[PDB]
């Protein structure tokens, strides 16, 4: 948690549906946005911070909290617009004799600034004698090791945390979703959408040849007349069903 890892995400389509369908990820406390609703949204960058904490400490991973974790290890800002996912890691994180592979910063002269990382190990001088780099009276090493054990109590059993931040920059959004997009019919008017365009028409087959990059079609009178089918690249037509006034 003191040396929390940060994976930056870019240029992909995230099937949030994938983790949103797994009970192991029980703690899905998210602030600033709804998960169902953001699967139809796009951000420039996404950041994935992960680390392992004890069982009841999951609460500190939330905006405006205090404690060893939030003050010295992983602080979220007051104005946080992402999610926190946490699940028990009694799978392999714990060992019979204990895994000396986890540390939590215990002392630090100052609370973190949000999303700040501190991996520097310099004795915490609490007295007024310099410590010179050896632990002793009023001279404390910064980190300590969690005694993860299989029989440990739930509040002290293992726990992984994944923290999703979403940012919006003037840069084009490199992150989106698949949005369950496959359907095609012919010779019947349908509220058809092809990657963003709308309309209704009897979409048939065209003898007309696009160029490989060209997407839409037009006439002398700024009317859409052909849409290349994105999945099976073919030239369609567009014609709304018959209209015209009736006359008695």
């Amino acid at each position, epitope marked *: 948690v003191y*040396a929390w890892n*940060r*994976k930056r995400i870019s240029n992909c389509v995230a099937d949030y549906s994938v983790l949103y369908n797994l009970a192991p990820f029980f703690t899905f406390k998210c602030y600033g946005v709804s998960p169902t609703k953001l699967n139809d949204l796009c951000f420039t960058n996404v950041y994935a911070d992960s680390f392992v904490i004890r069982g009841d400490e999951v609460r500190q991973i939330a905006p405006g909290q205090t404690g060893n974790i939030a003050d010295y290890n992983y602080k979220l800002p007051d104005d946080f617009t992402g999610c926190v996912i946490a699940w028990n890691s009694n799978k392999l994180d714990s060992k019979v004799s204990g895994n*000396y592979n986890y*540390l939590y910063r215990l002392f630090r002269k100052s609370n973190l600034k949000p999303f700040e990382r501190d991996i520097s*190990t310099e004795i915490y001088q609490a007295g007024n004698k310099p410590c010179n*780099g*050896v632990a002793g009276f009023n001279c404390y090493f910064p980190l300590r090791s969690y005694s993860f054990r299989p029989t440990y109590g739930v509040g002290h059993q293992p726990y992984r945390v994944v923290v999703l931040s979403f940012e919006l920059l003037h840069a084009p959004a490199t992150v989106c979703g698949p949005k369950k997009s496959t359907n095609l019919v012919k010779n019947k008017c349908v509220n058809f959408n092809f990657n963003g365009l709308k309309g209704t028409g009897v979409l048939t087959e065209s003898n007309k040849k696009f160029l490989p990059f060209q997407q839409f079609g037009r006439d002398i009178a700024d009317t859409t007349d052909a849409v290349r089918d994105p999945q099976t690249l073919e030239i369609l037509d567009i014609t709304p069903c018959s209209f015209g006034g009736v006359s008695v």
Partner: antibody, heavy 127, light 111 residues
Framework: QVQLLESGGGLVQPGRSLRLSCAASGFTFDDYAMHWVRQAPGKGLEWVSG????????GYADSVKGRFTISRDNAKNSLYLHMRSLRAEDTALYYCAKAVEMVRGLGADPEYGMDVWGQGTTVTVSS | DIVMTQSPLSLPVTPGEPASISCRSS???????????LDWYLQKPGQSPQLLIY???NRASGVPDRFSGSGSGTDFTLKISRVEAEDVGVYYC?????????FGPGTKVDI
């Protein structure tokens, strides 16, 4: 070309600290699990510590457990090894090696294959 | 906490013949995938060591086709199809399964 440069050597008395640093240059530093391997003077090699692709340590040697502390930084492409309770029996060369299999390229994640080795430092302890 | 041994402890080889070295373990390294995790490394004297074989028998990159690796269970062997003047030094076998990792005492090959 791939370069692994380490620094931090020098005579230090017993009962102090040191901070060895290994810097990598020439590859995507976040798809390779680093390792720190000692080399006693005129003896065989001996694994010391390691770190996976996600900054998650993979345990230390049985006789060294308790003092050494590894840390990584993908932003600066830097791996560091804080050393505590230095004793006379800790004098040796120290190489920082890199794994071979890039992660998710094929069961589990890879950790074997120390292929590229920098020229180690010459840490020593005496009074 | 796995202890490995090598044999022979030290053998003299002459340029133009094959040689065979055996590494033995305590617990068979057959993983669930079916792969042995033992690795063979050559530490040339006066120079940093270099990789020879990874994943039991999959030949490493950039080394010539004169080396062969075989074995399974708790016994593995490395055979130099043809030995030459540039194959002298120390050889080690290192586990890649139950952490911490371990390195054999080392075989000393000379002329």
């Amino acid at each position: 070309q791939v370069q692994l440069l380490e620094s931090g050597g020098g005579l230090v008395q017993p009962g102090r600290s040191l901070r060895l640093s290994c810097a990598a240059s020439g590859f995507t530093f976040d798809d390779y699990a680093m390792h720190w391997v000692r080399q006693a003077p005129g003896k065989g090699l001996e694994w010391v510590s390691g770190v996976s692709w996600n900054s998650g340590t993979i345990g230390y040697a049985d006789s060294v457990k308790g003092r050494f502390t590894i840390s990584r930084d993908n932003a600066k492409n830097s791996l560091y090894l804080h050393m505590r309770s230095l004793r006379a029996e800790d004098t040796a060369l120290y190489y920082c090696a890199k794994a071979v299999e890039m992660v998710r390229g094929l069961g589990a994640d890879p950790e074997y294959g120390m292929d590229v080795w920098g020229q180690g430092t010459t840490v020593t302890v005496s009074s | 906490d796995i202890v490995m041994t090598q044999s022979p402890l030290s053998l003299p080889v002459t340029p133009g013949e094959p040689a065979s070295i055996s590494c033995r373990s305590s617990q068979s390294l057959l993983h669930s995938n079916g792969y042995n995790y033992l690795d063979w490394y050559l530490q040339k004297p006066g120079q940093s060591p270099q990789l020879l074989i990874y994943l039991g028998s999959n030949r490493a990159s950039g080394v010539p086709d004169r080396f062969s690796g075989s074995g399974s269970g708790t016994d593995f062997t490395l055979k130099i199809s043809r030995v030459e003047a540039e194959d002298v030094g120390v050889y080690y076998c290192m586990q890649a399964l139950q952490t911490p990792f371990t390195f054999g005492p080392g075989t000393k090959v000379d002329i």
